[PDB]
């Protein structure tokens, strides 16, 4: 199986681009990151910053997670992100996504040794 740290990397990091430039960005990335394999994953967020800058959030502002756990951290500054969500016309075998680019603070859950991001909680 894939480790929790590697799964976060695969589902959420896109350091090769500064921001999404096309309305087609989500359909292409969800596919290439293998997120439309078994089913169409309903919602997913990509972060356009370096890996080192995202890992550093684990030492920033400690806050609660939506589930109540206390190993969540909010970034001190805003970051470039892209929200991907299925539209009314999406189906298994024919996934379709809406692309929304924005600049916001990110919130992640951290764990392990080294202590790194393992889950994407939300953006503000
Ligand atoms: Cl997400
Ligand atoms: Cl996640």
Curated annotation (Swiss-Prot):
EC number per UniProt: 4.6.1.18
Domain of life: Eukaryota
Active site: 12, 119
Reactions mediated catalytically: an [RNA] containing cytidine + H2O = an [RNA]-3'-cytidine-3'-phosphate + a 5'-hydroxy-ribonucleotide-3'-[RNA]; an [RNA] containing uridine + H2O = an [RNA]-3'-uridine-3'-phosphate + a 5'-hydroxy-ribonucleotide-3'-[RNA]
Primary localisation category: secreted
Gene Ontology biological-process annotations: defense response to Gram-positive bacterium
GO cellular component, one term: extracellular region
Function field: Endonuclease that catalyzes the cleavage of RNA on the 3' side of pyrimidine nucleotides. Acts on single-stranded and double-stranded RNA.
Description of how the protein assembles with itself and partners: Interacts with and forms tight 1:1 complexes with RNH1. Dimerization of two such complexes may occur. Interaction with RNH1 inhibits this protein. Monomer.
Protein family (similarity comment): Belongs to the pancreatic ribonuclease family.
Name this protein carries in UniProt: Ribonuclease pancreatic
Organism: Bos taurus
Lineage: Eukaryota, Metazoa, Chordata, Craniata, Vertebrata
Gene: RNASE1
């Amino acid at each position: 199986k894939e480790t929790a740290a590697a799964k976060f990397e695969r589902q959420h990091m896109d350091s090769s681009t500064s921001a999404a430039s096309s309305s087609n960005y989500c359909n292409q990335m969800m596919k290439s990151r293998n997120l439309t394999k078994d089913r169409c994953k309903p919602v997913n967020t990509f972060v356009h910053e370096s890996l080192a800058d995202v890992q550093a959030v684990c030492s920033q502002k400690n806050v609660a997670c939506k589930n109540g756990q206390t190993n969540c951290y909010q970034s001190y500054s805003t970051m470039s992100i892209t929200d991907c969500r299925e539209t009314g016309s999406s189906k298994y075998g024919n996934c379709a996504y809406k692309t929304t680019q924005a600049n916001k603070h990110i919130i992640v859950a951290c764990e392990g040794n080294p202590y790194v991001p393992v889950h994407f909680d939300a953006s503000v």
